[PDB]
A and B are shown apart, each in its own frame.
Chain A
């Protein structure tokens, strides 16, 4: 009974989204001039990690970045002088994500242990251990100095309060292990993608899923959010990268080539949003012209699979951390 209603609603959604397809992004962007070829050279190589790196996060100031590895070390670098400011041992050797607070005072990390650890840089001890998730924790982002969102394999995303260490708001109804989430430039909204092809948009204050997008065909390993605040591009185990729109509700363009068959592990946008940098399961990394879906350049300097990709706030540098301990800064 209810299944028929759900199917009718899904058909209505499909018809409504098909009604707004006035013109594809390719048609409009074909008139604009091509971006051209972009060659990027490794300006800095950061060394000191012991095992494969999974995630990094640039600081609010472009100088400092934090990276996580399977040793259980949360090393904080000064990318300008290639100096390890801090090396934070972890209680659990397995860590799958990290984040750097906007104020620059706190750093968080979490792994196969469901507990999310938050470290106080300026005081280096564990300020709070956030527990309550059931599965492996996959991503962390700091809404403020006091609020953090964690997405785990429990198929749920949660909003935490550091002072009380409790889940203020829990986001549910998402059918797969959530892999990555990204925040809007404003704190109001954030988006996440999971093992199921669906990537959902959430509202932090209300706690309800406003929109859902089912463009992909495999697990969504990575997600990034357009600087304008009205779009976001998601990587997948399928070779496609797709750019969705919040106001339009469906994908605008797809980024893939027949030559590449590997998946995507990390995506990011340039400051202007023209270049969509995406890591890949093969050793190299690719740079996509977001407007025209033409591969502008290739960043091939890593021996193993690329696991994390980031672009600094002012857009000066691009950092890539692969499954070799080496983390490289491109520009």
Chain B
């Protein structure tokens, strides 16, 4: 009868030591959620990097990315699980503005609006990836399936002077790319209170620096979180 308490105390001490080690390991790593459409090209981003988890480390920092496979349901109740993630990586194909499979771009905009305006994901920032940039350029310069017909607001839109055009680029596709970015940006800024931001990136399949981009975006996210905990920023 007396030895039972001692055995329980020893087991508790061993479990507590293991839990402290797990505390260190868990706090070391960062968790990211990968959301996108099936044709958005998330597989391309995964290759560069029920549920698929890929672990990558850069600059001796452990990053854990979780991609939810299947579960193709409009209603998302599992998404409340990803409340402690560092960021939500959103992948959208900007070249799919014309595909019927409600346009794909409009469906992605609606999905981004739903994710942004979620009670659980209030503090979680979103990293936005715009794949198939080359395909978008090929479509825009082709002269077929103009943005204006699919997106009426494109006609009134004007290219922003305070932009960063590519070193070798065509003004028409630059206008298209910045309009596609600005749609998501205005969805982001309409309801954000400064607790979470959106980082739009023009990515490509050939590009291999997306890991560095996600690392920088996570650094900025944590830095802004720490700044906003205090009255600064």
Contact = CB atoms under 8 A, between A and B. Distances in A.
Q: Do chains A and B touch in the complex (CB under 8 A)?
A: yes
A71 B22 contact: yes
Contact of A84 (B12, B23, B26): B12
B70 A177 contact: no
Interface stretch (B13-21, B122-130, B158-166, B176-184): B13-21
B23 A50 contact: yes
Given A48-B19, A50-B19, A71-B22, A94 B77 contact: no
B35 to A, nearest CB: 13
A161 B83 CA distance: 34
Given A135-B73, A219-B77, A112 B11 contact: no
Contacts of B8: 78, 81, 83, 85
Contacts of B51: 92, 94, 112-113
B22 A50 contact: yes
B9 interface: yes
B18 A87 contact: yes
A73 interface: yes
Given A84-B12, A136-B71, A219-B77, A51 B50 contact: no
B9 A83 contact: yes
Nearest to A115: B50
Interface string A40-84: 000000001011100000000000000000110101001001011
Contacts of A75: 15
A176 B74 CA distance: 11
B84 interface: yes
A153 B84 contact: no
Contacts of B26: 50-51, 71
B50 A114 contact: yes
B84 A84 contact: no
A179 B77 CA distance: 9
Interface centre among B9, B68, B81 (most CB of A within 10 A): B81
Interface string B61-72: 000001010110
Nearest to A54: B81
Interface centre among A50, A86, A112 (most CB of B within 10 A): A112
Q: Which of B8, B9, B18, B78: most chain A Cβ within 10 A?
A: B78
Contacts of A78: 8
Interface of B: 5, 8-9, 11-12, 15-16, 18-19, 22-23, 26, 50-51, 53, 66, 68, 70-71, 73, 75, 77-78, 81, 83-84
A52 B77 contact: no
A78 B71 CA distance: 37
Contact of B78 (A70, A71, A86, A153): A153
A112 B81 contact: yes
A183 interface: no
B78 A112 contact: yes
Given A50-B23, A114-B50, A83 B12 contact: yes
Nearest to A94: B81
A96 interface: yes
A170 interface: no
A136 B78 contact: yes
Contacts of A93: 53
A213 B164 CA distance: 58
B11 A52 contact: no
Contacts of A308: none
Contacts of B12: 83-84
Contact of A73 (B22, B53, B75): B22
Contact of B71 (A83, A96, A153, A323): A153
Interface in A74-124: 75, 78, 81, 83-87, 92-94, 96, 111-115
24 contacts: A48-B16, A50-B19, A51-B84, A70-B84, A71-B22, A78-B8, A83-B8, A83-B9, A84-B15, A87-B15, A92-B51, A96-B78, A96-B81, A112-B51, A112-B71, A113-B50, A115-B50, A136-B50, A153-B77, A153-B78, A176-B75, A177-B73, A177-B77, A219-B77
